[model samples]
Target: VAQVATVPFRLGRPEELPGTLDELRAAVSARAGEAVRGLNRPGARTDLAALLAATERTRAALAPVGAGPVGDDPSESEANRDNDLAFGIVRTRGPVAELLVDAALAALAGILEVAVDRGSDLEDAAWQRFIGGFDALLGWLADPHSAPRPATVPGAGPAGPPVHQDALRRWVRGHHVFMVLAQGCALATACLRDSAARGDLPGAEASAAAAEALMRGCQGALLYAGDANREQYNEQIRPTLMPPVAPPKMSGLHWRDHEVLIKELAGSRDAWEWLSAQGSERPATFRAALAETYDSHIGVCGHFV
Candidate 1:
């Protein structure tokens, strides 16, 4: 078996032809540029078609290849560090295209997150740009291939310690679930904002309810990951995240920005006219649900650390 230096997030192998990696790198960079332009369009109509086309171009460059099994070691590779550091499941595996796409999405997500968190303050034109950006990213991230898969067997017996690897994979997969739910929560919250702006209380309420449920799913994934790995965490797992082995400032807190935004929106209750009329019952329920999610995060995080 060939031992290849690879990142955790890559899924399969690539046909590393001439210019393939370069093409992917260039495409992803271009998309990042487009996303910046899309989010910064002040008073003009952001050219969403251009951004969408750029996104598709990056996707198109990611054609897959079937190959023999290979092993991966993420040390000192050109893999996306922040993505791996934050998610524990960096998309730096499989075809090089997957790695590039994963990194690209992370960059776009960062830009879009800050833009959207501006909430209702943005003018209609700018809000549309932010909205379109999220929709594009949500679809890109939801691609089935973006999730983690079983690792390739390339050693004499098992790869690393099976228990440790299994626990890591479970935690990584849980983060993946958390990401998807967070994306949905943001998108749904955006919808709620627009509905309230349009005086569509029913639609706004529905979106709030949907976000509430998605937040619960986020909590469930976090709880499940901690519970499932409790037995192995201290011995087999925690060391990997400790000194020498762990990268600088590699705590999971790197990813909490998205969660923070969701919490604020839920807390504010959008101050919708309809919400005011409906009394405290619904707002109280939403706040309590979000608080439970935060509490779960704190409890699980406290245990693991």
Candidate 2:
């Protein structure tokens, strides 16, 4: 909403599809100049507000990964909304699915900007901005584009038929933004929960390996960088692995003793060097994108592979 990093979206509303960390950064930078909605008009929704509303209200607990219920029951807390509206419209008829994706990504990038900017002190406005994006997508998720049954429910439960969960999963996987951002708020909460903790995307749930799933999503998206699809990974560069992913090693870091070293490892310069040798695309793919962040992870765990 600020004048700095405005998200991008096509329709009346605005934002979508951020893949790698670099891509997310690139996407945010690309749309940084988009117009911000100052006044609330009556008739039609502006691209900014429409998209902002969707990304803003998306609560974490409302999702499957967030431990949300599999059935539709808005009766639950606002957190029960499972607002990853980007994935909600998997089965949309050729008409608006892709467009929804655009809006979702814009909102996502919008909220992501908030998280990166005001880490630990994230406010309702930030949440609302992000939630608004997902909520908008949820509207389409329940659409009949899914045909036969369409995706009429949040969990896409048994009552529904043709629920396109896998399709959405595919879309999310290729896009690492979901992984990092999913862990986005959670990372803040977990880190802040430690009382004196701050910065980086690691720590929080390392004990139970809670974010292991999220990290995998991040890792999967990163590993699948250049490939358009999961199956296309082999055709991409050498698979870069993070912790808890077989190739990973060691545990988590509890203090900031090596803060300098961590950032050193996570530096974009080193990332560019590694990515340059990995594939045809130099420093633009997923690995290159995560060069800084993933290096932080490896640094956080005191492990280098």
- Write candidate 2's Cα lDDT for 1-305 as tens digits: 11222322122111123222233223232222121111122321334334334334332212211122224533322321222222231211221223333344444544443333232121333223223323322222222111011111111111212222222222333232432333232322232233112221222222112222223234433332222233233333456564322211112231111231233224334333433453424234434434544753432222454
TM-score of each: 0.44, 0.21
Per-residue lDDT of model 1, residues 121-143, tens digit only: 22343333323323333332232
Cα lDDT computed for each candidate against the true fold: 0.41, 0.28
Give the poorly placed runs of model 2, Cα more than 4 Å off: 1-210, 229-305
Candidate maximizing TM-score = 1
Evaluate model 1: give its lDDT: 0.41
| C-alpha lDDT (0 to 100) for residue 126 of candidate 2 | 29
Query: How much is 204 displaced in model 2, in angstroms?
Result: 4.8
